[PDB]
């Protein structure tokens, strides 16, 4: 999965991490349905299915 | 008729005086943080059930060691006449424990070793099978 | 190279073999095989009869033993104690363990540069003779010191 | 990107694995161009190749 | 003298002191060269001797320093050195008139947490460099017995001064390492107190990789993603108790 | 002088241990190779536990180690 | 001069107190460290309770202090 976000990924690991000046971040991620995002200090979990 | 006061010693060193007065404050801070940590954290169980005591285990030892774990625990396995078992890969970061003790039996020696190792490894002993196993952390 | 050490500090092999010869002349059993060394001491020359108490003159022999033991480089030293059958198994084992503990405490109190000392006793478990008629003066009553010389 | 596009998005990929010279060092053969070193107090060998 | 200066000036009005200052002229002229050299060589000798003695004492009692300093206990589970924290109590600031700003306590992160390979030791801070001096340089020889004696006592004073400066440097090193360990233990107490966030570190796992000439078996990458920091959420702080 | 003194004399030195084996079956306490086990807990030299002494030729007597640390204890005073 | 005089002698300088310790278990009346209690009530110099003596160069004997005050009795008079 190739994800464009304004947020960042914390837990599972990363392979390619592109980041622009305006805060747009591109993350290359392996096939994982569960992710954890650290929004401004507090971490919440997201689950994505097909 | 001459007067005196009891505790007279050899002459001292000012650098050791400074080290002592620093370490007094260091030890006091360590004591109070240990107190508040013990108060805050509720204990659950003791490792003596996992590490019991039996015969041919009360032969005593006096040990100073400040190196890697494996040579020391193989030495105490040879003392115990017990088999050795290793579980898990040895991590690239070495695990080091310094021990300065006097007249301690093998069971509490192993308990102190396991406590000082902490999260990095665990120790078990099966006396019926006459084995001692160590297991690295299933981490990273 | 003069700033580098030439030998180990406080070492003279002639003095080592001299005091070894003096100990074996006195009656202290000295045993060498490879770099593994053992010394046997009669327990009657150290303790009283079936009791863990030391003579005041025993400190001379202990000092001599520590002086000899300072001459080597070591890792692990083991002491075992053996006695004669008097009352039970438990009493003799406890006596031998106590004697080993006291002599190991004194040997650590002296500044010998070892890492690990193991201490144990067996009572009258392992005889070294078929002759078992003497009391504590019999040669089975003994204390054995064993190690392997490093390098 | 135009010639005025001085701005570039910054990328980070995987950190490198190791150094392949350390294979030869662990073997015992010094890397080419390395210098000899003097080791005292014990049995060890050392070299200086890229001032490391 | 100039204390009873009336009688001192009346004695100075005599011609015998006018020719008694002409023999103190050479004494005050041939004076200042010896003292500087004597003080310099005394400072060198005192610093070197005190440094060697203090390193000897440190190596003599080197074991209990390792006993009291276990950084391996303080290192967290992902081989990360904990950060260094400072605190301050009953703070105030008077920038100028009509303007005071006070506060209860302050906390400051000095050194950020990072990776590490080996725990630190006290030898990195408390050991002092000793090189023996072997170059006694003489600019001028003290000719008379009096100037030899003042050369000796000025060398002694330099010896004392070099000893004092060595003590000052050692004391600064002691304060530095005590600062570092106090910061570590305060960070541990604060993470117990739930006033600082824990760090976060991610692990990335890959299997075999590489070409037909180079391969690696288990490609693991460990990366510290979130640094510890103070949190402002005051309601989420657990108080303590004692018995 | 005599490493195997009051013994058989020196046979030869083994470089695997850095130790001199005497003509009698014994290990002498002397050393022969520099790759042998010493006991060195004291050393000389400036800029220890740092980047080492900077090999530049400074004009002044001030000496600063290679990791930026200043060696005042080896520097010249006034 | 003799600090532990008519006593067992001087053992060492307790630098925690800055005071000498006699061979009999008593502190000497002398001090031995400058970080000690020397109760002095008299001082020297001028431009006191001010910014100190200003080290600038004046053509006259007028000495100003760093707070702007001028020490007249420390200055060259006429």
Coordinates of C-alpha atoms in Angstrom, one line a residue, chain F residues 21-75:
Chain F
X21 CA 58.2 -22.8 28.8
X22 CA 61.2 -23.9 30.8
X23 CA 63.3 -27.0 30.3
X24 CA 61.5 -28.6 33.2
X25 CA 57.8 -29.0 32.7
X26 CA 56.7 -25.5 33.8
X27 CA 55.4 -22.1 32.7
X28 CA 57.7 -19.3 33.6
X29 CA 56.1 -16.1 34.9
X30 CA 58.0 -13.9 32.4
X31 CA 56.6 -12.6 29.2
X32 CA 58.1 -13.0 25.7
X33 CA 55.6 -11.7 23.2
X34 CA 53.7 -8.4 23.3
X35 CA 50.4 -10.1 22.3
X36 CA 50.1 -11.7 25.8
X37 CA 47.9 -11.2 28.8
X38 CA 49.1 -8.3 30.8
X39 CA 47.3 -6.4 33.6
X40 CA 47.3 -2.8 32.6
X41 CA 44.9 -0.5 34.5
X42 CA 47.0 2.6 34.4
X43 CA 48.3 4.5 31.4
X44 CA 49.9 7.8 30.5
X45 CA 49.1 10.1 27.6
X46 CA 46.9 13.1 27.2
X47 CA 43.4 13.2 25.7
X48 CA 42.4 9.7 26.9
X49 CA 38.8 8.5 26.6
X50 CA 38.4 11.0 23.8
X51 CA 39.4 11.4 20.1
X52 CA 43.1 11.4 21.0
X53 CA 45.6 14.1 20.9
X54 CA 45.2 16.3 17.9
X55 CA 48.3 15.9 15.7
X56 CA 48.2 19.5 14.4
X57 CA 51.0 21.9 15.2
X58 CA 49.3 24.6 17.2
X59 CA 51.2 27.9 17.7
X60 CA 50.2 28.1 21.3
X61 CA 50.6 25.7 24.2
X62 CA 46.9 25.0 24.3
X63 CA 46.1 21.4 23.4
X64 CA 42.6 20.3 22.3
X65 CA 41.7 16.7 21.7
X66 CA 40.3 15.5 18.3
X67 CA 36.7 15.3 19.6
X68 CA 36.8 19.0 20.5
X69 CA 37.7 18.5 24.2
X70 CA 40.4 20.8 25.6
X71 CA 43.3 19.3 27.4
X72 CA 44.0 21.9 30.1
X73 CA 45.7 19.4 32.3
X74 CA 48.4 19.0 29.6
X75 CA 48.2 22.7 28.5

